[PDB]
Amino acid sequence: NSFVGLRVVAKWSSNGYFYSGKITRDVGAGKYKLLFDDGYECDVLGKDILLCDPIPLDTEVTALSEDEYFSAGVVKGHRKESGELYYSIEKEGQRKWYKRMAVILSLEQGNRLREQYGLG
């Protein structure tokens, strides 16, 4: 049954990147209302919504530092603690932990996952 309440990684149209969020409504004809984890909402096409929670091991992602830098990295681990998700991301042979909200996908990285994980 129905996609509502599912955690996903969904495209944000203005910038092309995919962000963690939840489907809150099936708006019809292939469209879905999304509440991103930052609290932004919008309608998103099913084809721009990736059914991956968590983002997959061995995936190239975009990691966010606290001073607003970013970089690519490869997911090498997932960890649950106190109900929260953490990613282990490798960059130049070094692994570092990131919170769920510090990991996003560029247009190119999300697009890679569409055939396996998209709701298109």
Next chain:
Amino acid sequence: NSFVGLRVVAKWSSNGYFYSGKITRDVGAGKYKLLFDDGYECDVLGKDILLCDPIPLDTEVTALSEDEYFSAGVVKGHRKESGELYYSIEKEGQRKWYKRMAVILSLEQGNRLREQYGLG
């Protein structure tokens, strides 16, 4: 395209448990030849094949000790090292690492995943 070469967790008919393996052939009409990671093969119905690599965070699984004991546990982490998969499994509040081949699903545990992950 085609399911061949996909890593999966598939039911072994005699005992009801699901084991790690790969689809090697589409035998037709919903059936698939499987090469389990131990090297056993058989044909398996798509409905008894779970498209999860790895087995999902927060899933109840069956963990295998080296002296042939087993127990239930909950997946709390995934880790890649040197190309290999490792699970962190929690039992009574304690976490322990297991190799891929030391983690299976009982009939009840695999059956839980069928709606989300089955090829039925």
